[PDB]
Amino acid sequence: SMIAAYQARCQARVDAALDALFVAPREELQRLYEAMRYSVMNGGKRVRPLLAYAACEALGGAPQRADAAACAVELIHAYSLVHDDLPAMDDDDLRRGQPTTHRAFDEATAILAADGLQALAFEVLADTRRNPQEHAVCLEMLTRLARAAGSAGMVGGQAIDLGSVGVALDQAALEVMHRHKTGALIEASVRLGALASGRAEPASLAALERYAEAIGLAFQVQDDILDVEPTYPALLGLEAAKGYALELRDLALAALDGFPPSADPLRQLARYIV
Amino acid sequence: SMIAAYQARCQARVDAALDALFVAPREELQRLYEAMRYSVMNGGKRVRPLLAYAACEALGGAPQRADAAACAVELIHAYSLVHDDLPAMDDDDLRRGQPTTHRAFDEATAILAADGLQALAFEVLADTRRNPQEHAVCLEMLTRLARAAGSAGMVGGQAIDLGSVALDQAALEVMHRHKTGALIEASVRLGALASGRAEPASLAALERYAEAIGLAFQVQDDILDVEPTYPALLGLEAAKGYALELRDLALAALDGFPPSADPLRQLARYIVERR
């Protein structure tokens, strides 16, 4: 497909940029940096970088402009999964058949590596060589990532989740959890790409935000559906869940009304998800 | 010396600014925000904020200019302590007699509250209302904090410590300079940036200052514990002498600074005069 090729391009590109970030500045830090590299360079699909690049293109920006954005959102993502894997959280020994970072190294080193990955996400955005936007735009990219990654966004979502165990969530509560835990960062990926284009305007930003809201949820619905083929199918029944995923794809496509052909990657992604 | 009063003024001010950051934006996030507040609003002495304010004043800036800097360095510091307390690290039930965050709440919540505190540190610096410097200066503050807080600074120092075992003075100093020095130095740097009057020579001198006091503090601390350390490496009396040498280097780095740098001078003396 066109989307398969777009994904593969985004993945090669961001991977090359990320791989360069993990050189220990001195010998004593080698194992720390190897854990950082292990936590990031793990064959992930890089959906968040794809979204940054595609949002950048949708507004007419050359995609290399979003390199730093793409790296930052992937760094946030990766750190979040390392902390999530720990015994006090999800306690996961394996991710796609490979040991998780605390299992491959040790729990302290995993905690620290991921802590350093979060810092690096911000470092890369603030670095006007790696992220060479107008300074006001660099700051807005930082602001948006920090809000989305923190306790009002992704980390907050993780807290809502742990605070809902043993409660039977209704759909509205489930969606509140998803919008925080995964939606904030998806939205920030699109927002930061769009900002990197050097052509953002408030109307186009608001429309891309509607797009992102839609596809973020659509990812979760469809994930639950593929698991079958407190979940969307369990709440709704399998068939109504499938209908809901199509509704989300339609909201996503509608948000892109008026965009030029250079938004086709975002349209194609919305279809691919469902 | 008025250093105690300077410290108390810096503490009240930064505490007021920090306390305002822990309002949950909706109900479902209340307990997370409470754990964040619990992890920061613990009566700490706020040395890093003190440094940001004093560096700002040392360069003729009004101190409220450094409010965001002060908050950001304290947030990084507070998150680092919460993760350090965790069972996989130092495994402490107590911090100054009070239950650690993982005990008062739970381990996941401690991990997450601290993760959120790190994001907030960057949020506060990038927020041009809370940190109303020129844009280029906001970015340099962000750059410096990020580098100091991450795997090449504070987190790296934590890894070096974890990774160490049979260690010589140079290697001990490498560990300290990362684990504690980087953030101490960034506190001074950010405050100086916030003055609006930074320049390379002054920045460099303040960096020498920060290097010196960060180390002096660790030397004096080992000396007081008596009661792989500075006294064991050097002998108790040469360690005491080395603490004075570090204070002197700190004070020499501030040669030529005006009287408004007096808080930094008094702080350097205080570090080696305690007990």
Ligand SMILES: O=C(O)CCn1c(=O)oc2ccccc21
């Ligand atoms: O599994 C693969 O390697 C290709 C699958 N794949 C694709 O074709 O487009 C995608 C967009 C986002 C994530 C995965 C995608």
Ligand SMILES: O=C(O)CCn1c(=O)oc2ccccc21
């Ligand atoms: O802890 C007190 O209230 C008095 C001790 N104290 C002081 O007098 O100045 C200080 C600077 C930093 C940390 C502690 C300091």
Ligand SMILES: O=C(O)CCn1c(=O)oc2ccccc21
């Ligand atoms: O972490 C703290 O707040 C207490 C330790 N501490 C202090 O009280 O004065 C210091 C000066 C330099 C480095 C650490 C110092």
Ligand SMILES: [Cl-]
């Ligand atoms: Cl389709």
